[PDB]
Amino acid sequence: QGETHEFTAEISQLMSLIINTVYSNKEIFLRELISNASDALDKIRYQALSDPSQLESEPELFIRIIPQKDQKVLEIRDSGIGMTKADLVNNLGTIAKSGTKSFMEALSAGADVSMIGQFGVGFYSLFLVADHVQVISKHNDDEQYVWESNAGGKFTVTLDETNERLGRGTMLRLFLKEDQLEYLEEKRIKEVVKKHSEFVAYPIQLVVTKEVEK
Amino acid sequence: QGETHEFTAEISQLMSLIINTVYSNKEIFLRELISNASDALDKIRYQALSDPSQLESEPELFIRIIPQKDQKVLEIRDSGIGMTKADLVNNLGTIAKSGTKSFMEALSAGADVSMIGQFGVGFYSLFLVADHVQVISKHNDDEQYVWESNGKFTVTLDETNERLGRGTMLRLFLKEDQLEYLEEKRIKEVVKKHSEFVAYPIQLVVTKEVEK
Ligand SMILES: C[C@@H]1C[C@H]2O[C@@H]2/C=C\C=C\C(=O)Cc2c(Cl)c(O)cc(O)c2C(=O)O1
Ligand SMILES: C[C@@H]1C[C@H]2O[C@@H]2/C=C\C=C\C(=O)Cc2c(Cl)c(O)cc(O)c2C(=O)O1
Ligand SMILES: [Mg+2]
């Protein structure tokens, strides 16, 4: 029952730029996704001021990073406001954010890719480190959905009948490129996170899997 | 489409015994579940010698322990052979396995619970530390199912949990006085003490907040 959609041209152009012309500072993808998560948590907190029942779906407010070495996947989960189906379709492909063209012009003018969040399209920096991505999201009073794309021209949005229940919020699953597997290692993730985590108000949890020795 | 079934008498009788018992070595539940996991992995490993395609669904052979503190749940996952819908219905409630009665009679006579695995029903020692349990399982060429009981149980097509690929995951809803088994140090102690001779990696998933 999976809708298929095409990326709007400006977003396809933006991903083209990012994938093909940005050679350094690829680690900023994690700052950008942590920022999106923090914003999403801000939003549910705001709603909770007028209606504290909105937090009941998932009471703890967190940002969680989960390296999955077996699958060569890096997951980033938050318990923020989450997204409906229409939210996923519009925020992540069909509507070009106002800043998309502006950001492409800024890159051409000499901007560092680190600036991408100032233009509201920080999501797309993940394609610096991944060719395939799933976005799982759960909004109050709606079902859980999965958005998926392979850094191409189309994406799908489907009712989620295969992933763990989020309760509320969003989880990105980054299928990392073969030369970008450094981001599955605890020490590298901590290094990158500590650079820009001094003013994040929420706990950033790192899930590490280690074999029991002895 | 969730089939609901009643526990067979001898199994319901057994769980009552275990759940109510006063034991001091309740930590043996983890040895029993790790042993079940190791057995399931042996079986898919052997089958894969004649048909290596059987591992493609989940190429890694592992035992994975995942404390979920927010939910007060301890998960134990393996990539073994898994169970069909019929396997779940029969193995875990409707058919009393040979040795169910024998172990209950031994327990009533005073035997230590540590003996349960020799009767092949070590699964039910999880009720030493949990009141509710879900068993998620995926066998090759069948769908993923969830068995659940908190004196009836249900088996349902799994459309809510992470895909296992292949194998089995127990989700133990721990009693309020048994939450020590969510702590990294306690689990490592129990694993090193009683599961030292397992042929597969036993992985512990630990969540730690980053110092911002
Ligand atoms: C619409 C909601 C709430 C918005 O406040 C967040 C700010 C920017 C979000 C941009 C998005 O594209 C969706 C999104 C992404 Cl990409 C992410 O990594 C994490 C998230 O939690 C959300 C989200 O759930 O977004
Ligand atoms: C039927 C298969 C293969 C069997 O060889 C294992 C030996 C005993 C298993 C007993 C069971 O009740 C099912 C089971 C349990 Cl309880 C468990 O904790 C972990 C598992 O991986 C399996 C399983 O998938 O078992
Ligand atoms: Mg072994």
Residue numbers in the entry:
A (entry chain A): 5 to 218
B (entry chain B): 5 to 154, 157 to 218
Please give the exact wording used by the authors of the publication that reports this structure.
Hsp90 is essential in all eukaryotes where it regulates the form and function of diverse client proteins, many of which are key signal transducers. Hsp90 enables drug resistance via multiple molecular mechanisms, most notably through the stabilization of the stress-activated protein phosphatase calcineurin and multiple components of Pkc1 mitogen-activated protein kinase (MAPK) cell wall integrity pathway. Hsp90 also serves as the previously enigmatic thermal sensor that controls temperature-dependent morphogenetic switching in C. albicans, a key factor contributing to the organism’s virulence. To identify potentially exploitable differences in the Hsp90 expressed by a fungal pathogen vs humans, we determined the crystal structure of the C. albicans Hsp90 N-terminal domain, which includes the nucleotide-binding pocket targeted by all Hsp90 inhibitors in clinical development.
We obtained structures for the domain under three conditions: apo (unliganded), in complex with ADP, and in complex with the prototypical inhibitor radicicol. Despite the presence of different ligands, overlay of the three crystal structures showed an almost identical conformation for this domain with a root mean square deviation (r.m.s.d.) of 1.32 Å or less over all atoms. Global structural similarity between fungal and human Hsp90 was also observed when comparing the chaperone-ADP and -radicicol complexes. Additionally, the N-terminal domain of C. albicans Hsp90 shares the same architecture at the nucleotide-binding site, which interacts with both ADP and radicicol through hydrogen-bond interactions at the same amino acids (Asp92 and Thr174). In initial work, the crystal structures of apo, ADP-bound, and radicicol-bound fungal NBD showed minimal structural variation. More problematic, they also showed little variation with respect to the human NBD. The natural product radicicol was the only Hsp90 inhibitor found to significantly inhibit growth of our engineered fungal strain.
